[model samples]
Target: SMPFPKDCSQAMLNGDTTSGLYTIYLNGDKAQALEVFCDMTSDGGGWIVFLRRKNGRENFYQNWKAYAAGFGDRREEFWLGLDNLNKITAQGQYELRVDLRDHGETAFAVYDKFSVGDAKTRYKLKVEGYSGTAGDSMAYHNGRSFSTFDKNCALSYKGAFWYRNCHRVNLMGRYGDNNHSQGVNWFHWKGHEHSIQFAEMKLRPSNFRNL
Candidate 1:
């Protein structure tokens, strides 16, 4: 019951250009707004950062409840929460963007159609239309269910992610040692044996043409 300036894109449309913490309303005001980090200066601006990993300060190997409600600091490392992710994507079509860096090297991947299912569906992943230099590692994860150690979708890694057989790119994995599958990884870019230095996942309206 707030207003139509629901997300960062609206904020951008309203002439706000600063990139920082902003309250985003989901389900067209049917739900309460939640505070999230906005990247108003990346790729074409109006991006809502859903996941970020810079250092190992925040733990990624958390429980279902923890992952559901989310954890970590929004200004630094964080997961925007499955519940929020679900509601945000449910209301509209969205585009997904991933940015990565490794020892000063940088890369990115964009998905034209992206969304997450509700809890009844175990927050399943649906990603398609990939195009970027980071490679298409995420393509292997499409249709997978979000899993944690408690759920046991895969035994090779510990971080909660949308995994079926396992992950080929685990951006939520550990930090340090960029040479292990258990470490933060983007397999197509660094391979399963190497982890990346930085990773950020964000979302925006699909029609925002300024990519």
Candidate 2:
């Protein structure tokens, strides 16, 4: 049921201090949108997000403090605002990367978009580090007061999906607790799957009919 491009890859190469990368194909002069969900508060470091076009041009958005002062706080979700088409080219591939650089080391997650059309749309979701290591586990529901998931999967009962115990460094092995977890969940309820992350476009029949 995933709508990712055909040639998607999640590879880690030598000299690469990152976790993974995802790429999408954009065809032509059409507009595009994307949403990224991350837990960037683990390992005591900060997180950096990047967007790059096919012509090698790039843009960046960063949040220095993704977590609260104490431990086990909810992770905040950040939106990638690419509303200005003039900032990027209308064709070729676009890449998105998430870098964890805080704990004396660095890790990354990269996503690429290739071949966008005039009126097409797409959505991509990714999560890095679902658990903690070396006594550095992410605390769940510190401020939000949500419960933790004993199981391996990252799920919560809170009304809004917030990250709990996200470290500043370490993009691997982190967990997220959804403070407002009820009913169909945000992904299914908000129609995010059908509509691009921030395209302001109408949801197509294929999105609703399938659900």
Candidate 3:
């Protein structure tokens, strides 16, 4: 019998061509399997979706515990959980791709490296090597720890995020609003006051440098 794939990339390699829910083992441990939405039709496919916001039906404003475990529908809008992110990225290097849309305009941002720390570290964010149309707004969050309204690590924000003083991009911000600090805002692409209509953040293992 064939074993389960470690992540979406492996699933695609194993002949999966559709985008939907798939079970993958974290750290290649069968006992740590988790269900996640995979985007098998985007840039080269094999992206494991971590965050998605479309209709703004799910409230992102919550406590630390809620962000740690995550909430929302996996098939629609959701956060794939910080613990799961730590487990998946722990296996090796991974790249992050962020897709955004405001009104009718769309843009994307890619980070060559992306990883989150464990609970003890408050799930600190580490991202670098940016390239895309969305600009490097996330670079401001580098090394910052995730915070919610209950936490005082960063300036008061409506939703949970790796806020540093504040944030240049609050993808988890309030929905249906145009306030940069209140809505799902991506500063560089759509400006500071335009709440993007849709957004999705996905990750995948990186490939070797061809030399």
- lDDT string for model 3 (1-211, tens) is 2277777888777788899999898877789889989899888888999999999899888787878887899999899899988888888998899988866878899898999999998998989999999989999899988888876422355777898867788888888777557778888777668778899999998772221
Candidate 1, residues 39-142, lDDT tens digits: the string is 99988788989999998898888888887898899999999999889988886889899999888999999999999999999999999999999999999999
Sort by TM-score, top down from the best: 3, 1, 2
> What C-alpha RMSD separates each model from the true structure?
2.1, 17.3, 2.0
Candidate 3 residues lying further than 4 Å off, grouped into runs, are: 152-155, 208-211
lDDT of each: 0.84, 0.22, 0.84
Question: lDDT tens digits, residues 1-211, model 2?
Answer: 2243211221111122342233322221123322222213322211112221111111111221211111121123222222221122243233333333222433333232211122122111222233222121122211222112321112322111123442211121111212222211123122112111111100111111122
Higher-ranked by TM-score: 1 or 2: 1
The RMSD (Cα, Å) of candidate 3 is: 2.0
The positional error of residue 104 in candidate 1, measured at the CA in angstroms, is 1.1
Regions more than 4 Å wrong, model 1 = 153-155
Cα-based TM-score, every candidate: 0.94, 0.22, 0.94
- Native-referenced Cα lDDT, model 1: 0.84
Comparison by lDDT, 2 against 3, better one: 3
